[PDB]
């Protein structure tokens with residue numbers, strides 16, 4: 305009926321605690337917000353189901 | 354400024370609907386810097 309809800313901090317996965325990597329990750333724009341948006345849409349649906 | 358202003362920026366909107374909204378993950382920042390090196394003191398023989 306449902307599966308485990310997961311959230312990710314895309315910046316902590318990719319760059320965890322590096323400010324240098326975090327400034328380089330901003331060059332990609334929206335991708336990390338899209339990843340968090342997609343996992344949030346999956347997580348809300350486990351409760352709906 | 355406050356959690357509502359962060360919600361407005363995360364939604365890129367000056368108005369927000371009824372809901373619960375994911376905002377930036379928090380993090381306890383470091384209080385001080387700790388350096389730990391061996392108590393070796395004698396300089397290395399590079400002239401030789």
Ligand SMILES: *[C@@H]1O[C@H](CO[C@@H]2O[C@@H](C)[C@@H](O)[C@@H](O)[C@@H]2O)[C@@H](O[C@@H]2O[C@H](CO)[C@@H](O)[C@H](O)[C@H]2NC(C)=O)[C@H](O)[C@H]1NC(C)=O
Nearest residue numbers: 386387388389390391392393394395396397398399400401
């Ligand atoms: C390698 O030698 C340099 C310079 O050549 C020597 O200069 C005199 C000190 C004397 O020994 C001559 O026979 C050599 O030709 C060293 O450079 C000196 O370093 C000291 C600090 O250690 C500094 O106060 C001096 O001003 C420097 N003098 C000059 C002329 O540069 C250098 O330290 C040696 N390299 C290593 C890795 O030990």
